[PDB]
Symmetry: D2
Subunit: 249 residues, 4 copies
């Protein structure tokens, strides 16, 4: 019987590459999304054509609120309803935008950035654990948390909290055979918004090849961590940054 | 003119010692509290007896909510109203209790993440917007070796490390330094049996005792002083080597 | 076929690394200091699997005036035997207490800093100058929570972290990646077993080798200056 | 009686500032030096004119060799011979220059960079501890150890080892009441050989004031760590870098 995985924010970009690689490795997948309905359904279609009844979508807003625990429980439940098991949780979905110290209200910024990057991962990890082989969770972190982007405090706090979740959950869930690890991209797929000369500015910073990570390269590290080759690894965070975090100002 | 400091959760234990030591250094102080009104007022009266009109109290819940930003703005405002300036913010108030993975969970999130991280962020924003300026965040030396089943508390304290770094970077142009003090084992719970208190004390390499509140306060006093004028984004462990000790 | 140098490859973790590399399709230089019989025994086993794919190399890795020449010749042995050197695994390691309050202190320095840090530095330099190229340094997950009275050992492993970072930075333009694997408790030299969150047991050497294999692979092509803990959560556990 | 301190490489720059500040706080001092004999004696003359019999000089090479243990023993012994006690050791002396991976022999570079930055601190710590109130050791580290200068591998290895010494020595010496801490400057006093325009390049990188640390600012953090205000602090490293280590590439 095939194992099953939940990947949050899996309709596009890095989460999609993670979903695809998991599926190619033999997993059934829940493709979670928020706004990208067309891309999500398109992916599930691609994957089911490849193997029947192996992918479903699940729409959920991961902003912090009094019903976020219910939404997170429902995401996990959807995997069990579709596949009868849930072996892997990948916490990939993430809001990312500046929140200068000196538009959306600050209430909303806190709820979105801390919700998506930290609180939802915590609730999903809770629901995953309580619903329970090679069980594991992989959190998408950030290689640059100690050298943050200017004016991204709430985002950075969110990613720092996710490091703490990775460590605390690895410690507490180890007795249940659940491993909890992280993958920390540096510069990977760049914003569709961002201009090209600015893209090349970031690209030129990366020691290894003067280029951003492909989504597939980020996915490779996720696959390692969920695999039987990582069965003694828990509470570890693998940087996938081409040495970017090593470069001084 | 004497500088002014806001200390959150200053009615007792560590925040109290910090408020006392700031006051003794010559600061006027806003003693923030949540539930401990009598202790907060007792402290203000004691400090005002030392120097008239140098201490005020300020009640506020720092739990995350849609009123938290306004509450934080008012805390900072109260220092300006009382003393006409606000030179130092100390983020000390902190909820701390287990949240096992296996109060409603939404309340635990609001309290643990609100006090430890979001309120410090909102207070930092308000402090900066209103401008030897500095902020000191009370962290935790044991965040990479956390207590079992304290995930939300640990997340909040990591978030606070992130805030200290991000705010240090962003506020350095405005000449505001942002640092942390990270206790290991300090003031134990009042109700904790001495036998359990001794299990903790014996873990600490340096003197097999917990840090006094005054020892934690000493590091805060250093960071706000003219002797730390180039220090920003640094976190000082005050843990007697506890974090160095393997399982 | 690509070729790999594994230092201290005769026994234990270094042996598991060499075998797994060999199973992945590498030709391997099995380096040894004292364990000649074991090194040849491994070489024999690997050459029986595929002819002319494993050779041995003797060198003492203690710090000295001759360490640079020794490290140069280890790298050269790989080029001589296989005509290329794609992977360097710095696994060889001295391990023993050096209390702050038998061997002279200067010998303890030569072994604990020479084998753990200086030899990896000189092997790295030789590897880079002779050029999916990568180096993997065998680190220690307990570097920040060290064994009592192990200062020199801990110093050498910290220096090995510093080498991993500096070399990853400096050698990236050359397409040489440089990473580490940080075991917690693997092969002992029961108290420790019960401390480990994940299964209350030590890592097999094979579990360490798995992480090395990942890092040298096409699946780690963007990973440099990263250190992967393989410690079953041990470093997360407070005193 | 006044306490006594050994400061290594104390003839000029940051070591002098530390010895001066300790002397100003009331310590008697051993001004260790290697080549800077004139500057060392000049410093001692100034300090002794301030308070008679309160400063001595001590010449020693701190390069690694089979006699380094005897040299380190003698430095500590010089403090007991002059002052009857040794309360504080500041490991400040440090060789610093590039050793590219791709002049001096490599054996000499290793001996100098690893000897001065790591092995001598270890031997001095050993001697200090064995010769033995408020006892402590302060190690001069480097805030940039995780974002190192290109081509400084041996220097970087030395400072990492020094971080390890600080942690290991704090653990093992705590039972004896000896505290062990570090001060990690970012950019402080720039090289005498460095041209002004290159100095300004480094200055502009520092968020807090776009300027290097003064020697006094570094000395201030040392004075804190040796003081009664740091009585529970051990195994801590205080960055004094104006935010420099937080700035991404
Ligand atoms: N890209 C990089 O260079 C980089 C660098 C460092 C770290 N990372 C980390 O790696 C992971 C993947 O990065 P990425 O760039 O692929 O991410 P992304 O495109 O910015 O976001 C991934 C997905 O998160 C979902 N999301 C955003 N807000 C949400 C909300 N309120 N509720 C539920 N889902 C929400 C979105 O889903 P919908 O489209 O369906 O609305 C989005 O497609 C992220 O955790 C990120 O922080 C990326
Ligand atoms: N004690 C230790 O060993 C230790 C160890 C590591 C870190 N720390 C850190 O050091 C700091 C001080 O420690 P501590 O033990 O003295 O703290 P504490 O006694 O646990 O709490 C400090 C104050 O926090 C305030 N607080 C709690 N919940 C609040 C809420 N929802 N809204 C507003 N204020 C709230 C309380 O104020 P009221 O009493 O007025 O209700 C309380 O007196 C904390 O940041 C802590 O995490 C302490
Ligand atoms: N075992 C663990 O639980 C553990 C924990 C943390 C870190 N590690 C790291 O994992 C790696 C391998 O561990 P291990 O336990 O297998 O190592 P080990 O058994 O202690 O030694 C590995 C090999 O190092 C070589 N070696 C020692 N001194 C040498 C010298 N002076 N010159 C040349 N070679 C020398 C020896 O080769 P010869 O036999 O040929 O003389 C030895 O077989 C090491 O880097 C270690 O620090 C292991
Ligand atoms: N300057 C900075 O921006 C900076 C940045 C990061 C870290 N740091 C650290 O802060 C400390 C002070 O920096 P600094 O720039 O003042 O240092 P420095 O001038 O480069 O060196 C200080 C002293 O080290 C001594 N020294 C060098 N080689 C020696 C040897 N083989 N044996 C014995 N002593 C030797 C020299 O003594 P003699 O002159 O008598 O020959 C020199 O005066 C150092 O540990 C350094 O690594 C400094
Ligand atoms: N959720 C999430 N998190 C990020 N950290 C993130 N980062 C970038 C980015 C783009 C260029 C340079 C550096 C980062 C991005 N385009 N999207 C992102 N989305
Ligand atoms: N806000 C807050 N944060 C803490 N980290 C904290 N910790 C302890 C404590 C007691 C004994 C042993 C270890 C910790 C405590 N009694 N109160 C605390 N309050
Ligand atoms: N080279 C080397 N380096 C080590 N760090 C090492 N460590 C252990 C060990 C055993 C039990 C608990 C902790 C460590 C060991 N048996 N051999 C080792 N060999
Ligand atoms: N021993 C020692 N260690 C250093 N790290 C050091 N650093 C600088 C230097 C100045 C410009 C920017 C950064 C550092 C220096 N002039 N001397 C130094 N000496």
């Amino acid at each position: 019987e095939a194992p099953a995985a939940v990947v949050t924010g899996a309709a596009k970009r890095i989460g999609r590459a993670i979903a695809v690689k998991l599926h190619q490795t033999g997993y059934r997948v829940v493709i979670h999304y928020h706004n990208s309905a067309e891309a999500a359904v398109s992916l599930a279609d691609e994957l089911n054509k490849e193997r029947s009844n192996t992918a479903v979508v699940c729409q959920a807003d991961l902003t912090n609120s009094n019903v976020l625990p219910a939404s997170c429980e429902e995401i996990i439940n959807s995997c069990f309803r579709a596949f009868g098991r849930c072996d892997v949780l990948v916490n990939n979905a993430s809001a990312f935008y500046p929140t200068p110290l000196v538009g959306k209200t600050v209430e909303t910024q806190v709820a979105e950035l801390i919700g998506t990057n930290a609180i939802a991962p915590f609730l999903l990890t809770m629901s995953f654990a309580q619903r329970q082989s090679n069980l594991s969770i992989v959190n998408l972190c950030d290689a640059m948390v100690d050298q943050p982007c200017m004016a991204f405090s709430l985002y950075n706090m969110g990613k720092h909290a996710l490091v703490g979740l990775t460590q605390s959950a690895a410690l507490e869930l180890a007795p249940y055979g659940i491993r909890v690890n992280g993958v920390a991209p540096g510069v990977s797929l760049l914003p569709v918004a961002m201009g090209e000369e600015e893209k090349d500015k970031w690209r030129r910073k990366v020691p290894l090849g003067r280029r951003e990570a492909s989504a597939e390269q980020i996915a490779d590290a996720v696959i390692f961590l969920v695999s039987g080759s990582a069965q003694y690894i828990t509470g570890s965070i693998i940087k996938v940054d081409g040495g970017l975090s090593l470069v001084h100002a």
